[PDB]
Amino acid sequence: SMIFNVLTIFPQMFPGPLGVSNLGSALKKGLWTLNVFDIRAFANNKHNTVDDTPYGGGPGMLLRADVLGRCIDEVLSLHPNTKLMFTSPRGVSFTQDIARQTMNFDNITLLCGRFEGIDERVVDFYKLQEVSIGDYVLSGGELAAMVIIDTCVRMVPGVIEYPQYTRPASWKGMEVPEVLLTGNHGEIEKWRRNASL
Amino acid sequence: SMIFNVLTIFPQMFPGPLGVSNLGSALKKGLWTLNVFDIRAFATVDDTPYGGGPGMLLRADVLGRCIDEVLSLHPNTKLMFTSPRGVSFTQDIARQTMNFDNITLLCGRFEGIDERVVDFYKLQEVSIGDYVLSGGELAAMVIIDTCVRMVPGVIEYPQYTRPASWKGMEVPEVLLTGNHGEIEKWRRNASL
């Protein structure tokens, strides 16, 4: 069973899109496992704070190393060989091929940043692998984690170019390419290859 | 208010991540608007493809009824469809998308959609990255979060906060000096 551990201050977002259709049923059959750790539960402080203002000035807030360290050490005690990742803009560009390389690991941990990010000592101490799902700024790392997990889980055994058409044969005066209705396997294959280029 | 219309066979997924924190509170106070159209209400929505092939395909007639309804309500909406063949979504493309006050995101499922829908409506195809997802919903969320963040009112160096020492690792001392000039220099130099 491929195991994903997601570290978030918004545990209630999950499984969200991951609980639907093939992902969701594979999750119920135990072909993959989703552990969603609530970062706020490891705060262990007055007011229960996960974040604070950055040293040196600057706006916004930053996830604290001590809080994140407690969450991550708990994950590591449970999964000593997990691959620790972190959703961020300066990461490696996530691609189908990066997803396949990730598949070499049976245990992945996705730390989701919020606010202005995380204390950098966390990145360096744990040697987090930074991953970016694209060149755009999101509100936090959760959607990025969901993107990565969907991509990867689709490749777990047992889980799962040319234009396509289905009924009706005519819709708003627009007709399906006729070759598709001939049952002519050779012409259909030829048509599909040429429509693909 | 900036309007997003999402067309999906999984309306129950929304708002989801878009209903949390700043996005969620901006939504509740009306800085932006999320209309989630259930494609299934305008029908079976999917059928086997002409010519053979695995899987199913969302039907043109069903999608057309849903899209035509969206168009009667928002005649000037920018029609978009999330798909692997699309333009690469980037911060720049998000800024260009902002030039429209009204955006519609059709989310594909199964093996995709009937191609006449793409051509009749001239859907702008958008891809959030070079990877295959289970459907267009997460791509719609990424696009919406990205865009909504730039609506007024809604909202590279290493950073550090307390404690000053953690597992024997100290915060760079310059950040604790209150020395604005040296902090600026240090942040400039660490951004390379």
UniProtKB/Swiss-Prot annotation, chain A:
GO terms for biological process: tRNA N1-guanine methylation. InterPro entries: Alpha/beta_knot_MTases, tRNA_m1G_MeTrfase_C_sf, tRNA_m1G_MeTrfase_TrmD, tRNA_m1G_MTases_N, tRNA_MeTrfase_TRMD/TRM10. Its main location: cytoplasm. CDD domains: TrmD-like. S-adenosyl-L-methionine binds at residues 113, 133-138. Gene3D superfamilies: 3.40.1280.10, tRNA(m1g37)methyltransferase, domain 2. It is found in: Cytoplasm. Its EC number is 2.1.1.228. GO terms for cellular component: cytosol. Keywords: Cytoplasm, Methyltransferase, S-adenosyl-L-methionine, Transferase, tRNA processing. It catalyses: guanosine(37) in tRNA + S-adenosyl-L-methionine = N(1)-methylguanosine(37) in tRNA + S-adenosyl-L-homocysteine + H(+). Pfam families: tRNA_m1G_MT. GO terms for molecular function: tRNA (guanine(37)-N1)-methyltransferase activity. It comes from the Bacteria. NCBIfam families: PRK00026.1, trmD. Belongs to the RNA methyltransferase TrmD family. Specifically methylates guanosine-37 in various tRNAs. Homodimer. This is tRNA (guanine-N(1)-)-methyltransferase.
